Design a protein around this ligand. Sequence first.
Ligand SMILES: [Ca+2]
Ligand SMILES: [Ca+2]
Ligand SMILES: [Ca+2]
Ligand SMILES: [Ca+2]
Ligand SMILES: [Ca+2]
Ligand SMILES: [Ca+2]
Ligand SMILES: [Ca+2]
Ligand SMILES: [Zn+2]
Ligand SMILES: [Zn+2]
Ligand SMILES: [Zn+2]
Lengths: 65, 318
Amino acid sequence: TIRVIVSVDKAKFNPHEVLGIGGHIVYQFKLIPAVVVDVPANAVGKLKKMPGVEKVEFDHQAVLL
Amino acid sequence: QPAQTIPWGIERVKAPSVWSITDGSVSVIQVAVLDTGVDYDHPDLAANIAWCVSTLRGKVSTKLRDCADQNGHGTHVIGTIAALNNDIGVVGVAPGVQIYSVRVLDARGSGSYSDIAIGIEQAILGPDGVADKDGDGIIAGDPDDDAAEVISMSLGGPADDSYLYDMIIQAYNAGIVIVAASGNEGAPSPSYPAAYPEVIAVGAIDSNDNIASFSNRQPEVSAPGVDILSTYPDDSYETLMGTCMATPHVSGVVALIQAAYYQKYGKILPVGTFDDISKNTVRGILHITADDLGPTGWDADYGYGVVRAALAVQAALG
Ligand SMILES: [Ca+2]
Ligand SMILES: [Ca+2]
Ligand SMILES: [Ca+2]
Ligand SMILES: [Ca+2]
Ligand SMILES: [Ca+2]
Ligand SMILES: [Ca+2]
Ligand SMILES: [Ca+2]
Ligand SMILES: [Zn+2]
Ligand SMILES: [Zn+2]
Ligand SMILES: [Zn+2]
C-alpha cells in the first residue's frame, strides 16, 4: 500500500467504493473535500478512475525548519 | 529549577510592559504550535498547555506517548510564546496564553504533508472536533468555539499548490493568524509556508539589531533569533538560533494583540494582508508599530521591522 490524498466532488464521490479496489480511508477532512487513503500502488489507476475523484496526490515528506 | 530570567528577545519585542493589560490569559485565545510536540509536564509550561495532540501517521491522538516532544524544537518554540511568569526558568512573550501543541513532526523533525494538513485542521476544529459549533461563521475569536487564534508553523519546503495550501487558506479564512520562519539558508527569499501571502514570514535579528547572516531575506517582519534561551526537554532549558526562534516572538505578539483587543471589545481583529498599513488588522498593526530598521520602510533584510508588543497593543486599543 501507498498513502494518497484524494480530492473529491462530495456530490459524486462514493467513499464506500474505496474498499472494493483494496483501499482503506485513513482520514476524511472536515474542512476541505479530500480524504487520505491507503491503496496498493497498483490500484492508483482504478482510484483516479472512480467517480467523483478529481485529483490524486502522493503524500510527501515535510521537514522541520 | 533555575531562578527565572527574562531572555533578551522578550524585552526586545517589548512584551513585559503589556502584561499589566494582558499576559494573554483571555479565555477565548489559544496559540497552536505545529512542531515536534511539547514536554507537556515541563514546570515552566504545563499550566499553559490546553491541548497536547499528535496527527502523526494520520491518526489524531492525545496519548502522552504520541504527543510528547522527542526533538526539543516544539518545546523551545512553545517556551518563547508562553513560558510562565513565575519563580523559575524563562518567561514567554504571552506567559498567560493557552497553547495547543499539535505534533506533526517526529523525533528527527520529519513528517508528511498529510499529517501537517490534519494538524492545521485540528487547530481550527479544536478539542471538540467541530470548527463552528454555533454556525455563525465566527471561528477564531468566538468564545463558543475552541479554534486557535494563531497558528505558528515550524516547517520549511518548496511551493505547494495542493490540499495542504487549501488547508492554510481555510485557517486564514477562519480568522486565524498564521506565522512561519523565513528559513535559515541566508537565501534571497522566504521558504514556504512563510512565502504564502496568507502567512507572516519572520526573519531573525541578533541582540545588536543586525539581521542574522542565516536569515532568509524578504520577510514580512523580523524578531529576536540569535542566542534565544527557552524551555527544552526534559524540564530543562536550551539556547538556540534560527528564524524559527524569531517566529514564536511574533506569534506571542499576535496573541497579546488579540487578547487585549478582545478583552476591550469582545471581538478580535481581522488577520489582514502582507501589504497592510492600517490600524484595522493584526498585520497592519504589526507592520506600522514595528521598529523600522535598515533602509526606511519595508526592506529585504528586516521586512517592516522588529515587532513590538507594547506599541502594537497601544495602537490596537486606541
Ligand atoms: Ca480560540
Ligand atoms: Ca518562568
Ligand atoms: Ca471547535
Ligand atoms: Ca462560531
Ligand atoms: Ca458564536
Ligand atoms: Ca518533562
Ligand atoms: Ca526598514
Ligand atoms: Zn492503512
Ligand atoms: Zn504531489
Ligand atoms: Zn528550527
